[PDB]
Design a protein around this nucleic acid. Sequence first.
DNA 1: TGAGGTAGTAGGTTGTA
DNA 2: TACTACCTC
DNA 3: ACAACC
Length: 692
Amino acid sequence: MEAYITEMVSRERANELEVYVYVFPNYEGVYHIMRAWQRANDLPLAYNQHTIMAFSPVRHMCGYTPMETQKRHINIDSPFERALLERLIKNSLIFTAERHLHAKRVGHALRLNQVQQIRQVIIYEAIELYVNIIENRISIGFHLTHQFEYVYTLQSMIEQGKTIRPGMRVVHSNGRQHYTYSTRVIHVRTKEQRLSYAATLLKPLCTFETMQPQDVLNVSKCIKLSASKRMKCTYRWIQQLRAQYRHLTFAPNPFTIAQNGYKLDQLSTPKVHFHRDYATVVSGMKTGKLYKGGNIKISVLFDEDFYLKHHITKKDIYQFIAVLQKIAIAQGVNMTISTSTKSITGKFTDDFFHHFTEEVEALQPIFAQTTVLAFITSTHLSNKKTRSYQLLKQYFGGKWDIASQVITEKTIEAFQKILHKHGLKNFYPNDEQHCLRVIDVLKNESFYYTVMNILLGVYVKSGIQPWILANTTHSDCFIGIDVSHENGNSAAGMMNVIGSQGHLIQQAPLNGILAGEKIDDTLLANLLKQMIKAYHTQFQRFPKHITIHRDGFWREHTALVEKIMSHYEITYDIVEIIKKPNRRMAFFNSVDNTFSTRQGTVYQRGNEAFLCATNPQQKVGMAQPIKIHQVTKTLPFSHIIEDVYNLSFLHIHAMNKMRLPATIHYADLSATAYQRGQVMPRSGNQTNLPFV
DNA sequence: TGAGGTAGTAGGTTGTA
DNA sequence: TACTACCTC
DNA sequence: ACAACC
Ligand SMILES: [Mn+2]
Ligand SMILES: [Mn+2]
Ligand SMILES: [Mn+2]
């Protein structure tokens, strides 16, 4: 089974290419000159600032006189010339595709051909091409995708009855770029600026939000392809394009990693520690005790809409809570229902949810020092007049710092449907020999994952660590850093993982609200110092090595990190982790002519790597790789990749496996929760994951 | 909002000898 | 970044 | 204005 990558490398070196350079006397530069020359000459071109490069001499110059004309090679030491050559190569490839393959440069990709006609919806195939220069080598990477469009214009709505709403979403496509806003006049508006059209070019926007039902079910099946179909469709078109290109030459089979310079490494799943060593997380959860148990006080918030709008009684809620309790304690966690929620009977009605802002602040002393189990209906959580979820989370997190887990009516409806199927409606509150039977019949259903995710959320919101890593890692400390953007505001998500096995997963007790996307020196210094102090408190000794995991590209001051770290004589490393690298990985089996994917596979070339961390099903899609980049030199790169892979098995908030490591996956949530004002700092030395 | 996966859509900011 | 849809456990 | 992440 060969290992394939969605890239190729040329035989010609970067400096072995003969090009023409034109130099003319603001980054717009000579864009108009480019446009004039290419409309008059029918040639692939490119510019950069004030310099134009082409593969062939330009004859019709439209009365333009450059300063210097040269026919030379590229200078590798100049990034400017490398960028210009990459642009020229990309333009040449697009030119060849457009002429010889009937491809349209629509949006950011190349529209190729329509594959499905799903009841007045067209799905096209599109491809994205990327050209890079990696140490005198020219690499071309590509990525297949899809596009949506309706076959009917607003003129069709003008005729054949029915009208158009004033706030309707319409897109006008000129071929290269599209704007989103009887031959009647139209008044579309992309912004405060007003615009008008002929109502015969504008078409409705095709998005999953605006699609009618019984169409999303079919358009989704055509974009979620198997690995084999996706890779074969990519490679067939790439070979067809290569059959026409002449500027570069490639091997007959350039899609293997051997022809690209990558190395193959296979990683193995770790072991987790509940009370002994377990092969998998789910087995330990099913038949094991937690790593660090304790006591939880739980309070119940119940709304009357479960009874007025549905056939759900408070006794059903308390029997569900009793079942949840019986599932616990068997794992070593003791939960007790607080009795303080007894003088507010019937307080949560529709008027309460309509006047939440004014009726709140009388509920602090009854829900204090507990974890709230919220049983609000979906409509009240989602309705724009009420917005129960936003207000609940905002108040309870950013005002009183009380954890809360929300359960809607669909979960209880499914639980009662399971009970109906098994025909078991005995009293599950204060009556044993029935909760045990309910638990036994639950283990054979898929609702076990739901109830266990609910319990794990409650646990990590209360301060219980369910499991750790059985084996040690190559680094002591870990830090995850992320920044979120909403409405011109920014917030930073920062996490602490203390210990080699992840003995303590926690967030930094720092204020994440920042002005302008700039993590200042004071914040970074405070984060590093608090990480060191927390590790020293936990282990009575200073750490040896600290790893920094960054989401996206590292833009912070790298000199401050070394200045802080050399003071304490502690080594460090900085790693950039890129989700969505726009590449794909697969194994080709020539016996069956099929592509497959194996979790834990590493492609490494230099200080950059690709990692496979998921095993999605055939109808879910294809695994997305992760790009890992090392900025420092302290540790071997293989150890860093191993740490990144092993740290993603610490998804202590859910049974289902996540793709990214714990640091970044939780820093993202922390930043998002700080953006919406749903969390406030808390000082302590226990597990704290209020966002979950 | 039980949780996670993957795959479409539209905008926003960084940095560029 | 943000949103939406589906499937899986 | 192109490019890469958001
Ligand atoms: Mn980010
Ligand atoms: Mn994020
Ligand atoms: Mn949650």
